[PDB]
Design a protein around this ligand. Structure first.
Ligand SMILES: *Cc1c(COP(=O)(O)O)cnc(C)c1O
Ligand SMILES: *Cc1c(COP(=O)(O)O)cnc(C)c1O
Lengths: 457, 460
């Protein structure tokens, strides 16, 4: 078959991200070629159909098969596929997009957008900017960046260091200096007997303790996803963001909001920052910026950092930072069409409405399930965490592969939901066009899967 | 399709768009006016006011098939309609990325290459390289063997670790770079070589400097050496005769991996398939971007040799799935753009054009500028070339940087409708035209440059 020939070429020549390299190459872990899709459904090269309740990777937010977006990419590609944006050069779509991000989407007090292609390159830029900012101000020691356990901020050297999951550290010598990781903001794993408000205060106090141990004048920034994505779909505890921000303000520490997942509608607000009342100095975007139709990332720079960057150019000349593809015309054109759709179909409001329905349905269906320790989520992201003992929150032996098994049972029933890393967790992040009826279908399939695995154990 | 309201767009630009590599205050205030590029065809681009320019820099060494390829726009469009995106994590794939991987390995990359890993930028690809080099040494039980040796004036990206690799001060100053464990050895620029050394002697001097560095560091602590076959952003600097052979012998003696950064030289520019082919390099790892898609869509590649690949597979045995991935790794539309780009390069034999019209280019530049009083050196290979300007040709004396001699020659070219780059940290005029360029277009470029160089020479 054509699939067999392609799979063969794949195994012989393609190094996949996040794959068992030996077992892929040998054919021990079979591959899958995705060829098409529409709305929330995708299709493989053998014609099999799947409900994609993970929207690729939290990213195909307007759904699959938007010919509107393909048309917009095509028109830009015909007119001017590329020019650089170095030394004040520009193109029409990147200018239009920058104005739209600032005026209509980003929180108030944001000033400028800098572009790359990945969440990783955007967070790399953030770190560079934070160091530069402190050097411009004559604070050479104020450089440490505090991230969080289970946070996800990319897969590079410095960005993998920010990331708080061991797969991105082990055997890569990370994290490097000067990165630190504070408390995982996951109430389910809070110290025993803590209320939610107590746990938010515990997180704040642990951060303070870290800042004092480091010396506050050496701590430049704090980076956090409003809701943790890859670390297990973890909304923050009640009062967390207010308690954290008071500590950061007390010690003059910049806040970076990593909105790569929460950006552009997924929580039911425009950004996760809007949803939780965060006031970041710097914002990272990607994924839902284009619904993955073309690669694009953004660093949204607040007025306070921007003023210092302008001061920096006065004293030091043009900023020594650029990517060849910064502000790429076709990627910008894809973003514009994507945002047109999000606005026109009010997918932010759908994420709030169908999302609340999703969360309610998940709680009803799984809140008393013997296998499920916690049901959590906000808007159109949700997860089920599985435990061996609900009373003591005891984890399964990782060799039992409980999460991966529930995910595999879902896939047998034609639905894609992710076995989240470093845990037994089933995550959902469907396209923002999903209907309530489609939510029912997803929940029903998950219910059958969770039951099947529970019976086996 | 539609005219552009230039004044209004320029205004929105200044108020909201943070450009790469721009004077941020002067851009925002309007003191450095912007330029909006709206169109292009072949080697010419057009701004929003309708002005036309010959782009002798191919954007940034990247628009290699030339501008306005509707064939590539069609291929992007067909993939975007069929499947704009899915991830390639856990063995998932798409048809164009599989096809591209096979074509890169079987038809383009040097012998002994095994696999391709994908990103979107030269910078993210070199970031992947460093991760892979450290992982490789950890798999082998050599935790100390981690240092990466780069070179003065080398260019490898604009990130934290990649900017550290980069050997130009603009990417270091006020960013606290370079970090450990990066080192920089000798700039392979013969024009600035110790006086009275032949080219081959200077190659041996560079080899000996590298060896000295390795011994001072302790060879068991040195993991890899990274180099562009020909330096791009560091001033269009072909290596001296014998350089790559002499370097490789040192790297082999001390079990040090070679990374070839082919972001510029990859896919035809030197008149060979890769710079590695052209100079007889045998890299363990290869970085590509730019000419991989002719910039029609963002894509980068890390080409992994058989020796590193074997250890990566061994690593998976020991440690499980590799903890590395970008969301857009193997992006379908970017892969489709690459395939159409490579079809054009192969069909029109742009590698051969780069050799033929390139040799003509180099010869024409020598004839025109080899005795010019302002020009210390004419250099290049294939379709990259530079003029380096000096205040005294006998002693190779540099101009006071405040005279801005390089920027002024570039600005005079632009007045005459041609884009050629004032290269950073020196007085150097660089050329890297699209690979479709004709001899006739080379004559036009050379003539414009001649007038520009004469004009600035008169002013001094
Ligand atoms: C996916 C993700 C990233 C990394 O983006 P890439 O485009 O994969 O580099 C960064 N931060 C968060 C919060 C993400 O979810
Ligand atoms: C341009 C360049 C890079 C970085 O590529 P980006 O796509 O700009 O990140 C790396 N290496 C070399 C030799 C380059 O010319």
């Amino acid at each position: 078959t054509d699939t067999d020939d392609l799979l063969e070429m794949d195994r012989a020549h393609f190094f996949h991200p996040s794959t068992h390299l030996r077992d892929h190459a040998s054919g021990e872990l079979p591959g899958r070629i995705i060829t098409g899709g529409k709305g929330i459904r995708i299709q493989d090269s053998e014609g099999r159909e799947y409900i994609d309740a993970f929207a690729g990777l939290y990213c195909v937010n307007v759904g699959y098969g938007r010919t509107e977006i393909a048309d917009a990419i095509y028109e830009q590609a015909k007119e001017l596929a590329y020019y650089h944006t170095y030394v004040g050069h520009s193109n029409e779509p990147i200018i239009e997009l920058s104005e739209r991000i600032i005026r209509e989407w980003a929180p108030a007090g944001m000033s400028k957008v800098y572009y790359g292609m990945s969440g990783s390159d955007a967070n790399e830029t953030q770190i560079k900017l934070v160091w530069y900012y402190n050097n411009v101000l004559g604070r050479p020691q104020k450089k440490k960046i505090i991230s969080r356990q289970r946070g996800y901020h990319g897969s590079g050297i410095m960005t993998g260091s920010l990331t708080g999951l061991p797969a991105f550290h082990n055997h890569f010598d990370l994290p490097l200096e000067p990165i630190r990781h504070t408390t995982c903001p996951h109430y389910y794993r809070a110290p025993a007997g803590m209320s939610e408000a107590e746990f938010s205060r515990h997180c704040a106090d642990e951060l303070e303790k870290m800042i004092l141990a480091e010396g506050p004048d050496t701590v430049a920034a704090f980076i956090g996803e409003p809701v943790m994505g890859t670390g297990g779909i973890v909304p923050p505890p009640e009062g967390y963001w207010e308690a954290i921000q008071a500590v950061l303000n007390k010690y003059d520490i910049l806040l970076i909001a990593d909105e790569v997942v929460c950006g552009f509608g997924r929580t039911g607000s425009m950004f996760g920052s809007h949803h939780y009342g965060m006031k970041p100095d710097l914002i990272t975007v990607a994924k839902g910026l284009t619904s993955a139709y073309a690669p694009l990332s953004g660093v949204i720079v607040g007025e306070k950092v921007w003023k210092v960057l302008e001061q920096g150019s006065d004293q030091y000349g043009p900023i020594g930072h650029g990517w060849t593809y910064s502000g790429h015309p076709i990627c910008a054109a894809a973003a514009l069409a994507n945002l047109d759709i999000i606005e026109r179909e009010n997918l932010t409001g759908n994420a709030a409405d169908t999302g609340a329905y999703f969360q309610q349905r998940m709680r009803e269906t799984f809140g008393d399930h013997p296998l499920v320790g916690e049901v959590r989520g906000v808007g159109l992201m949700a997860a089920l965490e599985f435990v061996a003992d609900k009373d003591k929150r005891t984890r399964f032996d990782p060799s039992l592969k409980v999460g991966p098994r529930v995910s595999a049972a879902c896939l047998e029933d034609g639905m894609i939901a992710r076995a989240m890393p470093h845990g037994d967790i089933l995550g959902f992040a469907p396209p923002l066009v999903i209907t309530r009826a489609e939510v029912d279908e997803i929940v029903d399939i998950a219910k059958q899967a969770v039951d099947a695995v529970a019976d086996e154990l």
